Design an enzyme around this catalytic site. Sequence first.
Site, PDB file in Angstrom:
ATOM      1  N   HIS A 179      50.080  41.438  49.215  1.00  0.00           N
ATOM      2  CA  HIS A 179      49.401  40.202  49.710  1.00  0.00           C
ATOM      3  C   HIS A 179      50.399  39.246  50.325  1.00  0.00           C
ATOM      4  O   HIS A 179      51.373  38.908  49.729  1.00  0.00           O
ATOM      5  CB  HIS A 179      48.717  39.540  48.542  1.00  0.00           C
ATOM      6  CG  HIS A 179      47.536  40.334  48.069  1.00  0.00           C
ATOM      7  ND1 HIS A 179      46.994  40.225  46.835  1.00  0.00           N
ATOM      8  CD2 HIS A 179      46.871  41.372  48.706  1.00  0.00           C
ATOM      9  CE1 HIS A 179      45.949  41.036  46.713  1.00  0.00           C
ATOM     10  NE2 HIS A 179      45.878  41.805  47.856  1.00  0.00           N
ATOM     11  N   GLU A 216      44.175  46.443  44.656  1.00  0.00           N
ATOM     12  CA  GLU A 216      43.041  45.590  44.283  1.00  0.00           C
ATOM     13  C   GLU A 216      41.816  45.935  45.042  1.00  0.00           C
ATOM     14  O   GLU A 216      40.793  46.304  44.450  1.00  0.00           O
ATOM     15  CB  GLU A 216      43.370  44.090  44.428  1.00  0.00           C
ATOM     16  CG  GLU A 216      44.636  43.721  43.629  1.00  0.00           C
ATOM     17  CD  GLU A 216      44.448  42.350  43.096  1.00  0.00           C
ATOM     18  OE1 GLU A 216      44.669  41.373  43.860  1.00  0.00           O
ATOM     19  OE2 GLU A 216      44.161  42.152  41.930  1.00  0.00           O
ATOM     20  N   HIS A 230      53.298  37.224  36.069  1.00  0.00           N
ATOM     21  CA  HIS A 230      52.109  38.034  36.522  1.00  0.00           C
ATOM     22  C   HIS A 230      52.374  39.008  37.661  1.00  0.00           C
ATOM     23  O   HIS A 230      51.683  40.069  37.786  1.00  0.00           O
ATOM     24  CB  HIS A 230      50.965  37.076  36.890  1.00  0.00           C
ATOM     25  CG  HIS A 230      50.602  36.097  35.813  1.00  0.00           C
ATOM     26  ND1 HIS A 230      49.903  36.467  34.674  1.00  0.00           N
ATOM     27  CD2 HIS A 230      50.790  34.748  35.723  1.00  0.00           C
ATOM     28  CE1 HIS A 230      49.722  35.375  33.934  1.00  0.00           C
ATOM     29  NE2 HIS A 230      50.292  34.335  34.587  1.00  0.00           N
ATOM     30  N   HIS A 282      53.420  38.928  47.570  1.00  0.00           N
ATOM     31  CA  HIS A 282      53.588  39.491  46.219  1.00  0.00           C
ATOM     32  C   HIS A 282      52.841  40.789  46.227  1.00  0.00           C
ATOM     33  O   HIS A 282      52.223  41.135  47.237  1.00  0.00           O
ATOM     34  CB  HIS A 282      53.029  38.516  45.169  1.00  0.00           C
ATOM     35  CG  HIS A 282      51.553  38.239  45.327  1.00  0.00           C
ATOM     36  ND1 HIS A 282      51.086  37.121  45.912  1.00  0.00           N
ATOM     37  CD2 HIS A 282      50.437  38.989  44.964  1.00  0.00           C
ATOM     38  CE1 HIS A 282      49.740  37.149  45.919  1.00  0.00           C
ATOM     39  NE2 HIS A 282      49.344  38.292  45.339  1.00  0.00           N
ATOM     40  N   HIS A 297      50.616  44.055  43.863  1.00  0.00           N
ATOM     41  CA  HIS A 297      49.826  44.502  42.695  1.00  0.00           C
ATOM     42  C   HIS A 297      49.940  45.982  42.599  1.00  0.00           C
ATOM     43  O   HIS A 297      49.999  46.643  43.619  1.00  0.00           O
ATOM     44  CB  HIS A 297      48.333  44.150  42.949  1.00  0.00           C
ATOM     45  CG  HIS A 297      48.057  42.710  43.135  1.00  0.00           C
ATOM     46  ND1 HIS A 297      47.735  41.858  42.068  1.00  0.00           N
ATOM     47  CD2 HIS A 297      48.082  41.936  44.282  1.00  0.00           C
ATOM     48  CE1 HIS A 297      47.558  40.605  42.544  1.00  0.00           C
ATOM     49  NE2 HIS A 297      47.764  40.640  43.884  1.00  0.00           N
ATOM     50  N   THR A 338      42.462  36.543  43.644  1.00  0.00           N
ATOM     51  CA  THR A 338      42.142  37.638  42.687  1.00  0.00           C
ATOM     52  C   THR A 338      42.720  37.394  41.281  1.00  0.00           C
ATOM     53  O   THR A 338      42.635  38.262  40.382  1.00  0.00           O
ATOM     54  CB  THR A 338      42.614  38.991  43.176  1.00  0.00           C
ATOM     55  OG1 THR A 338      44.052  38.972  43.221  1.00  0.00           O
ATOM     56  CG2 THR A 338      42.068  39.304  44.583  1.00  0.00           C
ATOM     57  N   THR A 339      43.280  36.184  41.095  1.00  0.00           N
ATOM     58  CA  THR A 339      43.936  35.802  39.817  1.00  0.00           C
ATOM     59  C   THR A 339      43.342  34.412  39.476  1.00  0.00           C
ATOM     60  O   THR A 339      42.995  33.682  40.404  1.00  0.00           O
ATOM     61  CB  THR A 339      45.496  35.677  39.937  1.00  0.00           C
ATOM     62  OG1 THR A 339      45.773  34.740  40.991  1.00  0.00           O
ATOM     63  CG2 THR A 339      46.084  37.036  40.209  1.00  0.00           C
TER      64      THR A 339
END
Lengths: 261, 260
Positions: free
Chosen positions: A115, A102, A64, A89, A91, A196-197
């Site tokens: 993040h 995000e 992911h 990690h 996004h 958020t996941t």
Amino acid sequence: KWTYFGPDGENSWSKKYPSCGGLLQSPIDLHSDILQYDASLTPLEFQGYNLSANKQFLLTNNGHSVKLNLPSDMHIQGLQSRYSATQLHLHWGNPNDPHGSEHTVSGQHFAAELHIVHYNSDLYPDASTASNKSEGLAVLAVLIEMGSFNPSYDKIFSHLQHVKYKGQEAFVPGFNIEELLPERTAEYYRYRGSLTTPPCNPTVLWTVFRNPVQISQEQLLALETALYCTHMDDPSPREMINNFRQVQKFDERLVYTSFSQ
Amino acid sequence: KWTYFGPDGENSWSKKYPSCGGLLQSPIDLHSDILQYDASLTPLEFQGYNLSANKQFLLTNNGHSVKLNLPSDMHIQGLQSRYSATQLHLHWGNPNDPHGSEHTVSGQHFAAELHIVHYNSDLYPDASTASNKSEGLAVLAVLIEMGSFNPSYDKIFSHLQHVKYKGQEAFVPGFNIEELLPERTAEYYRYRGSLTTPPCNPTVLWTVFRNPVQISQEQLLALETALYCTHMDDPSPREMINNFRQVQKFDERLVYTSFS
Ligand SMILES: NS(=O)(=O)c1c(F)c(F)c(S(=O)(=O)CCO)c(N[C@H](c2ccccc2)[C@@H](O)c2ccccc2)c1F
Ligand SMILES: NS(=O)(=O)c1c(F)c(F)c(S(=O)(=O)CCO)c(N[C@H](c2ccccc2)[C@@H](O)c2ccccc2)c1F
Ligand SMILES: [Zn+2]
Ligand SMILES: [Zn+2]
């Protein structure tokens, strides 16, 4: 097998993960009507962020995102418990639309978002455990815009070709993680939200820094083209692109700001 | 069943309404990266919009929005097929955050949004039957911003007190629905998308006018405060606010514009 695109994308997460349909969901759009200055939002202190270059930290493609594991001697101080680092990690969007943050600010996406996930180490043994608990997680978010080449972010991006596929792991020498934070870290937005996941646990204290950092178009292109969600041997490969959730309704929540103007 | 708030909120629509998690979902952000001028987009003609002031039209609070029934002799000319009107309704935010349009432009919400729903009456007998078929629906969307008082919107809004609770109805005398459209209706965005409410069928041809209309601050507050989602005898009343869907991902696709 949740994803960000298709039948198993974000409007379907709640079928298997009920909290993703629950309250307090992130990310959100940061805009004036829901902002309120709070003078008690004092500066965070970043302890143990200067990781030794002679040590090494595991980078993993988890299908992911790509994550770097962080040591528990790394902490944020200033909160009402100490929170210890577990991983960072990113996004991002895709090469034709480099707009995959995000959080948005007054309705605009930034290019990407970093993040840094922490868990309440005062009260919990690890992040998995803290993750379904009140007060359990604190995530720091850095908004990333296309701009100058960033040597600090390159300390991570230079290893992406070694974690192209799901399950692959590589080691990154230690560096000072504070180099990934923007100018004037004292200015941030703070709010109660969620992962958020999936499983979308509503257990995160968000700090989003007011100021973005810059990485170059070539660095964004590498990030957006290096990685796959699928295993090396998958006959149905899927690029890891556009791995951000849409912003969520702000169910009566305000966002508190450490800056008045 | 479904709501705009809480456990039965938009992220959970896809359990009972699988097309809410499928393709071609609306609404979307209209931003310049994805705009493409198309010369084929000529002006629509609004036929039968001047409703007989000797006829009355039913206004309903259906627990999701307020809707006005429209007559099938009302239609759009200019598309492939004739699309005949079935109803209009609105979407709005709340007084603390009065920015509840469904579509956004360059990432910005307008205060509210009016939808005039039509169905392909050349192909189908009514809107219910068209709603899940190819080419079934066409919706006109008008973006609304706070500004001058609008008498034409007040022909609807003056009745809101009589439809305060779910299931309540009122009669509205015919007026010219074209008065609810903005300046230069030749200027619009067009794309294929979906209903923005369950069952979210990907069967709507969207036309979103480029220019917003204005309503006064008092008109906008009336719309945000007049209505409830709940029946009158509900011991736990819920205000009808924030009755819009979040914008959907819209990738590797264009929105076509009638203007350059
Ligand atoms: N964007 S977010 O900050 O809200 C987020 C993510 F976007 C994200 F992609 C992950 S992930 O581990 O990188 C891949 C999806 O699980 C995690 N990882 C989770 C996690 C890691 C450390 C501590 C708490 C949570 C997640 O994998 C997890 C969830 C629940 C329980 C344990 C771990 C996460 F928190
Ligand atoms: N927002 S929207 O323009 O995309 C839209 C439409 F495009 C649309 F065609 C309809 S509909 O004409 O009533 C469907 C025919 O039954 C509704 N009405 C909703 C509906 C009822 C039955 C079947 C599908 C959709 C109704 O739930 C509603 C009415 C008013 C405002 C919100 C929701 C609607 F909200
Ligand atoms: Zn994240
Ligand atoms: Zn609508």
